PDB file of C-alpha atoms and ligand atoms in Angstrom:
ATOM      1  CA  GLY H   1      -0.016  -0.030   0.038  1.00 32.51           C
ATOM      2  CA  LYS H   2       3.067   2.213  -0.294  1.00 30.76           C
ATOM      3  CA  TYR H   3       2.792   5.184  -2.602  1.00 31.38           C
ATOM      4  CA  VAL H   4       5.363   7.481  -4.174  1.00 32.76           C
ATOM      5  CA  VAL H   5       4.908  11.225  -4.375  1.00 30.62           C
ATOM      6  CA  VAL H   6       4.467  12.321  -7.963  1.00 29.81           C
ATOM      7  CA  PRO H   7       7.839  13.646  -9.249  1.00 32.00           C
ATOM      8  CA  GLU H   8       7.929  17.376  -9.940  1.00 31.22           C
ATOM      9  CA  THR H   9      10.877  16.852 -12.286  1.00 32.58           C
ATOM     10  CA  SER H  10       8.624  15.178 -14.856  1.00 30.97           C
ATOM     11  CA  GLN H  11       5.921  17.867 -14.824  1.00 29.13           C
ATOM     12  CA  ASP H  12       3.591  15.527 -16.727  1.00 29.70           C
ATOM     13  CA  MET H  13       2.641  13.535 -13.568  1.00 28.15           C
ATOM     14  CA  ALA H  14       2.395  10.353 -15.667  1.00 25.52           C
ATOM     15  CA  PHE H  15       4.473   7.425 -16.834  1.00 26.74           C
ATOM     16  CA  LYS H  16       3.795   4.603 -19.222  1.00 29.08           C
ATOM     17  CA  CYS H  17       3.750   1.233 -17.496  1.00 28.66           C
ATOM     18  CA  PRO H  18       6.085  -0.910 -19.702  1.00 27.69           C
ATOM     19  CA  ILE H  19       4.770  -4.195 -18.301  1.00 29.17           C
ATOM     20  CA  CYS H  20       1.054  -3.926 -19.023  1.00 31.05           C
ATOM     21  CA  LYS H  21       1.103  -0.680 -21.051  1.00 30.60           C
ATOM     22  CA  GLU H  22      -1.304   1.607 -19.123  1.00 31.20           C
ATOM     23  CA  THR H  23      -0.447   5.292 -18.762  1.00 31.68           C
ATOM     24  CA  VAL H  24      -0.004   5.810 -15.000  1.00 31.06           C
ATOM     25  CA  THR H  25      -1.636   8.966 -13.754  1.00 29.25           C
ATOM     26  CA  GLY H  26      -1.546  10.288 -10.227  1.00 26.27           C
ATOM     27  CA  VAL H  27      -3.889  12.150  -7.951  1.00 25.55           C
ATOM     28  CA  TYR H  28      -3.318  14.916  -5.415  1.00 21.08           C
ATOM     29  CA  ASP H  29      -4.160  13.828  -1.879  1.00 19.16           C
ATOM     30  CA  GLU H  30      -5.157  16.830   0.179  1.00 19.26           C
ATOM     31  CA  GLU H  31      -4.797  14.922   3.410  1.00 21.00           C
ATOM     32  CA  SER H  32      -1.124  14.038   2.987  1.00 21.07           C
ATOM     33  CA  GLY H  33      -0.717  17.213   0.959  1.00 22.48           C
ATOM     34  CA  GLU H  34       1.182  15.496  -1.838  1.00 23.57           C
ATOM     35  CA  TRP H  35       0.539  13.914  -5.228  1.00 26.47           C
ATOM     36  CA  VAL H  36       0.302  10.150  -4.998  1.00 30.45           C
ATOM     37  CA  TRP H  37       1.382   7.266  -7.210  1.00 28.11           C
ATOM     38  CA  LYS H  38       0.075   4.176  -5.367  1.00 28.58           C
ATOM     39  CA  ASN H  39       1.088   0.514  -6.117  1.00 30.67           C
ATOM     40  CA  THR H  40       4.178   2.110  -7.586  1.00 31.60           C
ATOM     41  CA  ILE H  41       7.863   1.483  -7.073  1.00 30.72           C
ATOM     42  CA  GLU H  42      11.077   2.849  -8.467  1.00 31.09           C
ATOM     43  CA  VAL H  43      13.410   0.227  -9.992  1.00 32.96           C
ATOM     44  CA  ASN H  44      16.866   1.167 -11.322  1.00 34.90           C
ATOM     45  CA  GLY H  45      15.877   4.832 -11.636  1.00 34.21           C
ATOM     46  CA  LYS H  46      12.567   4.203 -13.329  1.00 30.64           C
ATOM     47  CA  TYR H  47       9.099   4.115 -11.835  1.00 31.14           C
ATOM     48  CA  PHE H  48       6.902   1.030 -12.429  1.00 30.94           C
ATOM     49  CA  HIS H  49       3.641  -0.231 -11.079  1.00 28.72           C
ATOM     50  CA  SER H  50       4.669  -2.246  -8.039  1.00 29.51           C
ATOM     51  CA  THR H  51       1.940  -4.761  -8.878  1.00 31.68           C
ATOM     52  CA  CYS H  52       3.414  -5.366 -12.326  1.00 30.83           C
ATOM     53  CA  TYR H  53       7.036  -5.730 -11.183  1.00 31.78           C
ATOM     54  CA  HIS H  54       6.297  -9.178  -9.683  1.00 34.08           C
ATOM     55  CA  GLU H  55       5.459 -10.620 -13.071  1.00 32.18           C
ATOM     56  CA  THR H  56       9.012  -9.927 -14.251  1.00 30.21           C
TER      57      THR H  56
HETATM   58 ZN1   ZN Y   1       0.895  -1.558 -14.843  1.00 27.17          ZN
END
């Protein structure tokens, strides 16, 4: 259930999931006060859906 705060260096707030090919969008959570990418993990400098990584 870990989430990653949407990178401000990308400025598009999205990345293309290479494993199942969905465009990953993120939402601003007003309670935590940050943009969220949930079920997401960074592997070797790239962000992937954490759910998808297990298939590889
Ligand atoms: Zn995915």
